[PDB]
Amino acid sequence: MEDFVRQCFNPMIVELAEKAMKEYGEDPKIETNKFAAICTHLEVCFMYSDGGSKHRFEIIEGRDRTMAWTVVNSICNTTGVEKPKFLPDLYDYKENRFIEIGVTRREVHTYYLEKANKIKSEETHIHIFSFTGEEMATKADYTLDEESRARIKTRLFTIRQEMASRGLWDSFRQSERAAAELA
Amino acid sequence: MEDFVRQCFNPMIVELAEKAMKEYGEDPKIETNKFAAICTHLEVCFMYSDGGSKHRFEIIEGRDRTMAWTVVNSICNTTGVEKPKFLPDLYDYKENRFIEIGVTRREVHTYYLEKANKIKSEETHIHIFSFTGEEMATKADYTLDEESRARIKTRLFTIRQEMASRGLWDSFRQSERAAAELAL
Amino acid sequence: MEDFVRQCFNPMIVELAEKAMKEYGEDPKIETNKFAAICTHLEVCFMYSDGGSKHRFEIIEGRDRTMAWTVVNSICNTTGVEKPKFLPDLYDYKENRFIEIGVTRREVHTYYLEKANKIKSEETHIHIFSFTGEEMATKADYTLDEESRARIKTRLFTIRQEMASRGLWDSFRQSERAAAELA
Amino acid sequence: MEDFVRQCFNPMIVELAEKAMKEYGEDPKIETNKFAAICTHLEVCFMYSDGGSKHRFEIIEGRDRTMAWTVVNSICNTTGVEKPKFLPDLYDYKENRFIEIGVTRREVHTYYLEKANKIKSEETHIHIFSFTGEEMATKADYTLDEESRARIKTRLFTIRQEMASRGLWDSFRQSERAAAELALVPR
Ligand SMILES: Cc1nnc(C(=O)NC(C)(C)c2nc(C(=O)NCc3ccc(F)cc3)c(O)c(=O)n2C)o1
Ligand SMILES: Cc1nnc(C(=O)NC(C)(C)c2nc(C(=O)NCc3ccc(F)cc3)c(O)c(=O)n2C)o1
Ligand SMILES: Cc1nnc(C(=O)NC(C)(C)c2nc(C(=O)NCc3ccc(F)cc3)c(O)c(=O)n2C)o1
Ligand SMILES: Cc1nnc(C(=O)NC(C)(C)c2nc(C(=O)NCc3ccc(F)cc3)c(O)c(=O)n2C)o1
Ligand SMILES: [Mn+2]
Ligand SMILES: [Mn+2]
Ligand SMILES: [Mn+2]
Ligand SMILES: [Mn+2]
Ligand SMILES: [Mn+2]
Ligand SMILES: [Mn+2]
Ligand SMILES: [Mn+2]
Ligand SMILES: [Mn+2]
Numbered sequence: 094m095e096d097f098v099r100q101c102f103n104p105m106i107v108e109l110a111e112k113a114m115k116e117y118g119e120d121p122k123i124e125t126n127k128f129a130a131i132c133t134h135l136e137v138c139f140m141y142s143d144g145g146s147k148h149r150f151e152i153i154e155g156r157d158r159t160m161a162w163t164v165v166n167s168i169c170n171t172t173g174v175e176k177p178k179f180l181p182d183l184y185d186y187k188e189n190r191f192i193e194i195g196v197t198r199r200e201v202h203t204y205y206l207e208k209a210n211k212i213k214s215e216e217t218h219i220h221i222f223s224f225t226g227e228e229m230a231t232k233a234d235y236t237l238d239e240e241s242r243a244r245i246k247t248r249l250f251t252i253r254q255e256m257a258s259r260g261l262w263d264s265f266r267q268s269e270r271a272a273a274e275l276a
Numbered sequence: 277m278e279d280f281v282r283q284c285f286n287p288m289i290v291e292l293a294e295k296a297m298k299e300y301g302e303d304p305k306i307e308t309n310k311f312a313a314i315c316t317h318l319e320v321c322f323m324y325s326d327g328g329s330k331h332r333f334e335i336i337e338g339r340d341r342t343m344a345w346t347v348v349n350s351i352c353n354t355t356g357v358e359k360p361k362f363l364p365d366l367y368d369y370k371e372n373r374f375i376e377i378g379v380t381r382r383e384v385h386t387y388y389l390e391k392a393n394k395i396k397s398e399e400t401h402i403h404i405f406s407f408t409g410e411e412m413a414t415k416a417d418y419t420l421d422e423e424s425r426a427r428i429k430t431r432l433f434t435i436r437q438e439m440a441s442r443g444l445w446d447s448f449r450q451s452e453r454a455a456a457e458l459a460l
Numbered sequence: 461m462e463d464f465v466r467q468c469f470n471p472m473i474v475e476l477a478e479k480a481m482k483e484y485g486e487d488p489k490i491e492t493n494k495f496a497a498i499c500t501h502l503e504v505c506f507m508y509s510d511g512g513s514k515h516r517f518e519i520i521e522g523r524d525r526t527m528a529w530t531v532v533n534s535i536c537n538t539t540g541v542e543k544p545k546f547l548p549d550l551y552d553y554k555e556n557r558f559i560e561i562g563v564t565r566r567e568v569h570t571y572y573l574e575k576a577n578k579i580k581s582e583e584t585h586i587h588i589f590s591f592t593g594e595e596m597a598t599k600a601d602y603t604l605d606e607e608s609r610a611r612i613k614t615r616l617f618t619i620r621q622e623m624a625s626r627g628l629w630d631s632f633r634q635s636e637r638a639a640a641e642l643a
Numbered sequence: 644m645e646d647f648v649r650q651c652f653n654p655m656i657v658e659l660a661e662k663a664m665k666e667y668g669e670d671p672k673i674e675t676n677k678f679a680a681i682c683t684h685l686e687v688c689f690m691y692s693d694g695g696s697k698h699r700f701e702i703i704e705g706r707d708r709t710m711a712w713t714v715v716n717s718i719c720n721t722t723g724v725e726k727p728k729f730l731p732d733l734y735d736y737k738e739n740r741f742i743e744i745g746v747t748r749r750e751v752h753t754y755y756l757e758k759a760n761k762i763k764s765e766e767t768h769i770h771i772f773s774f775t776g777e778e779m780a781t782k783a784d785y786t787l788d789e790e791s792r793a794r795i796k797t798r799l800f801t802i803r804q805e806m807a808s809r810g811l812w813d814s815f816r817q818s819e820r821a822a823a824e825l826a827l828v829p830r
Contacts, residue, residue, distance in 0.1 A: 148511075148607050151614065167617035171593035171610060186607040226354035240369040243354060244331055250350035327698070409721030423698045423736040426722060430701065433717035515694075515794055534800035538776035538793060553790040 094125035094261045101255060102132040109135055109155050116158075126268035133252060134196050137222060137245055138182050141194060144241030151184040154194070165191075175216050185218070185236060192236065195221040196249070198266045199273070205229045222246065224253040224266075277308035277444050284438060285315040292318055292338050299341070309451035316435060317379050320405060320428055321365050324377060327424030334367040337377070348374075360400050368401070368419060375419065378404040379432070381449045382456065388412045405429060407436040407449075461492035461628050468622060469499040476502055476522050483525075493635035500619060501563050504589060504612055505549050508561060511608030518551035521561075532558075542583050552585070552603060559603065562588040563616065565633045566640075568596040574640075589613065591620040591633075644675035644811050651805060652682040659685055659705050666707070676818035683802060684746050687772060687795055688732050691744060694791030701734040704744075715741075725766050735768070735786060742786065745771040746799065748816040749823070751779045757823075772796065774803040774816075 098121075099107055110131040111121050121128045135155060142150040151168060153161050161180055168184050169176045174191065181191035193212065197204040205221050209231075212219065220230040226246050228235065235242060256262040282290055293314040294304050304311045318338055325333040334351060336344050344363055351367050352359045357374065364374035376395060380387040384406050391402050392414075403419065404412040409429045411418065418425060439445040465488075466474055477498040481488050488495040502522055509517040518535060520528050528547055535551050536543045541558070548558035560579060564571040568588045575586055576598075587597040593613045595602065602609060623629040648671075649657055660681040664671050671678040685705055692700040701718060703711050711730055718734050719726055724741070731741040743762065747754040755771045759781075762769075770780040776796045778785065785792060806812040 146607070148611055151611075163618055163621050164614065166621060167614045170617050171613040186610050240329075240332060243369050244334075246354035247334065247347070247350040250353050251346055254346050254349060426736050427698055427701075429721040430714070430717040433720050434713055437713050437716055513790070515790060518794075518797065530801055530804050531797070533804060534797045537800050538796035553793050 094129065094265075095122060097256070097259060097261060098125065098129045098132055101129075101252065102136060106132050106135045106139070126265050129256075129265060130196070130269065133249070134194070136248070137196050138194050140241070140245050140248065141192075141220075141237065142183060144237040144245075145185075145187065149185065149187050150192075151186065153180060153184065153191075154182040175214060177212070177214055177217050179212065181217055188218070188234075188236065191217045193217055193219045195219065196223070197221060198224055198269050201227045201229050222249060224249050226250060277312060277448075278305060280439070280442060280444060281308065281312045281315055284312075284435065285319060289315050289318045289322070309448050312439075312448060313379070313452070316432070317377070319431070320379050321377050323424070323428050323431065324375075324403075324420065325366055327420040327428075328370070332368065332370050333375075334369065336363060336367060336374075337365040358397065358399055360395070360397055362395065364400055371401075371419065374400045376400050376402050378402070379406075380404060381407055381452045384410050384412050405432060407432050409433060461626075461631075462489060462495065464622070464626055464628065465492065465496050465499055468619065469503060473499050473502045473506070493632050496623075496632060497563070497636070500616070501561070503615070504563050505561050507608070507612050507615065508559075508587075508604065509550060511604040511612075512552075512554065516552065516554050517559075518553065519549075520547060520551065520558075521549040542581070544579065544581060544584055546579055548584055555585070555601075555603065558584045560584055560586045562586070564588060564590055565636045568594045572596045589616060591616050593617060644814075645672055645678065647805070647809060647811065648675065648679045648682055651802065652686060656682055656685050656689070662707075676815050679806075679815060680746075680819070683799070684744070686798070687746050688744055690791070690795050690798070691742075691770075691787065692733060694787040694795075695735075695737070699735060699737050700742075701736065703730065703734060703741075704732040725764070727762070727764055727767055729762050729764075731767055738768070738784075738786065741767045743767055743769045745769070747771060747773050748819045749773075751777045755779050772799060774799050776800060 102110075110128060113131060114121055114124070114128060119127060138152070138154045142152050151164060153164060156164070158180070165176065165180070165184075168174065172189055174189065177191055182194040183192040184190070185192055193208060195204055195208055201221055201223050205219060208219050208221070218231045218234070218236070220228070220236060222228050222245060226249075228242060228246065230236065253262060256265055285293075293311060296314060297304055297307075297311065302310060321335070321337045325335050334347060336347060339347070341363065348359065348363070348367075351357065355372055357372060360374055362376075365377040366375040367373070368375055376391060378387055378391055384404055388402060388404050391404065395402065401417070401419065402412075402414045405428060409432075411425060411429065413419065436445060439448055469477075477495060478488055480498055481491070481495065486494065505519070505521045509519050518531060520531060523531070525547065532543065532547070532551075535541065539556055541556060544558055546560075549561040550559040551557070552559055560575060562571055562575055568590050572586060572588050575588070579586075585598045585601070585603065587595065587603065589595050589612060593616075595609060595613070597603065620629060623632055652660075660678060661671050663681055664674070664678065669677060688702070688704045692702050701714060703714060706714070708730065715727065715730070715734075718724065722739060724739060727741050729743075732744040733742040734740070735742055741764075743758060745754055745758055751771050751773050755769060758769055758771070768781050768784070768786065770778070770786065772778050772795060776799075778792060778796065780786065803812060806815055
């Protein structure tokens, strides 16, 4: 599963995920499913930022924590938007709102409910993707046009097929359900 | 003809064509006309995908066949379009449809007829270009704007002229008319 | 402060600022605050030119003085616009006007009034940014859309935050105030 | 003048101009004014092709004559537009027409009328720039928006200024008026 992750995502995303996981004390060679999931979330965030006009999104995910909070503080002090309690994934300059991007192998309704109850702020926009082609956004406001989101969903289903053809899909799908049924 | 093919198309297209023809058991050095035709079809598909907005098209032609079918499956599952019986060339995320692209040295109406009768799927769009400047699309819906299609046609006619100035056009034009009579 | 400037701005801007300071007889190693100010103004000008269409702005700032005046004369002779008395920072081909860009650590309107009374031109547009998210432009015409200006403001606030975190913001803010009171 | 040309235009344009001058049996070291003129014309054609959107212009100038005529063949046979009798500079896929671009140190309308009487083509669009900022196009259809043409004119005036600052502008401007009067002499 580790060699698959290193062959499936580009080395920059792999390096960013390795750094983010070593920061939380987790191991790429052991917790390979979390490695894959973090790589997937990063690729989705980057494709999402690429979906709009050139200057539309400020990328928060993928940065170092302190610098990410610095950019969040700058955005809040210059636009007047409330500071989120948890680090978001993007900022939308066009719609003037923070975006929390989610990718799940689970039920999309349950994941959206979990994230919405975790955020509790009436500002941060939520947008969930899944490996089955479903997506759910705050107020059904999907931010991007249909082409960008469809590309993201196609990439996700391709990742799922690639995992299934080598027999890693079942364990990867049950890993996220294991972190929610245990933690 | 083989040296002409290697000089006329960029090395990435030539590499892709050689890999496809070795996948289908053919020889670039012997059947140089099909070498040229596959390079031409690949170039047309690429200009076509470049004709629209940034990421309007998913490119299926030019891939390993297994990965091509994987991408087709992903598209079909995330959008709901029916899975084609034959590998198409592009997928249009804007109009939500697969595109089969044809480049023919023969009469265009006949080529479109054979393509549409082989596809049978009432969803896969068909777009045919010729070496004379004539094009033909399903429902006269040409997908791209006039300028991109005109660039494609200009490039096709330039290929035809470069072939003819070397005495290679007659054999190339009869290569397709011969394999069409042999298949029957 | 010098190391912070060299690690905070990309080497092209740092080199242009070093050239601008050596041309005026100043030393970046000892006048580090003005080093930072020149780097910041250059970055803002370059972000501003990137704010519109690909070929909308002629960049006047960041050149050799003689070549910049040559380009100014060319613009004036081909468009008929009045030649400015001081080198501006940009030329807007869409609105057909020169642009003076300012970045101040004081109030935007004081700086605007000073610059306007200095240039004494009814044609040259003036656009002032601050390190606190405020902006002031001639006739309230901000040239660019909200997204590009918001990007610029966010970057300015991030620079201010980095300075503050290193304990250099106070001296940088009081340096501009100490230079104006000398006149 | 030759050093100025070599340091004023980017190396690709200098190479193209040298190739064209040798193709016409002329020495860029001796005929430095014509050297600069070819360089300026090529740069203007390239900025012009940039001025539009992505797939608008087929660039004809800058190619060798055989392939240029081959591309004009392809365009005429796939679009139905008329055969130009002389090699034009660009082809506009949006407006579906060939474009002849001229850059003159003389009066713009004099140059336009000379070119339009030479080519005598009903479809070939003509667009003339000068080193003073004047421009003139067929039916006042300038093809590009105002910003692109303004950039072109600004660059032309900058070239004029750089030439005059070096003492080369007077000879450059008298070069074109000396070649036009010579062409009007059958004797
Ligand atoms: C519901 C539900 N089910 N699983 C989760 C969940 O949160 N899982 C993790 C931790 C793996 C996660 N993390 C981040 C992230 O950015 N974390 C860094 C951070 C640090 C501090 C701070 F305040 C906020 C965020 C994501 O973006 C993200 O999509 N996920 C899934 O939520
Ligand atoms: C009518 C008519 N006249 N000639 C043909 C014709 O089909 N000729 C060939 C075979 C040379 C061809 N092939 C493909 C292609 O992609 N094939 C690979 C594939 C593999 C598996 C699968 F299920 C379907 C297709 C093209 O795209 C293409 O344009 N052509 C012309 O049709
Ligand atoms: C009010 C108020 N408070 N401080 C200033 C102020 O002007 N500060 C300086 C001198 C540091 C400054 N300079 C230039 C510039 O271009 N200088 C070089 C130049 C000037 C004139 C000319 F004709 C040719 C070249 C800027 O662009 C710029 O933004 N600033 C801030 O204004
Ligand atoms: C009137 C009037 N006043 N000066 C001229 C003029 O034509 N000057 C030259 C020759 C320097 C010129 N040449 C080409 C060009 O492409 N030449 C290639 C070619 C040669 C022979 C042939 F029959 C057709 C084309 C240009 O594009 C161009 O802009 N110019 C200015 O016209
Ligand atoms: Mn996150
Ligand atoms: Mn997230
Ligand atoms: Mn195909
Ligand atoms: Mn095809
Ligand atoms: Mn300036
Ligand atoms: Mn300024
Ligand atoms: Mn020409
Ligand atoms: Mn010309």
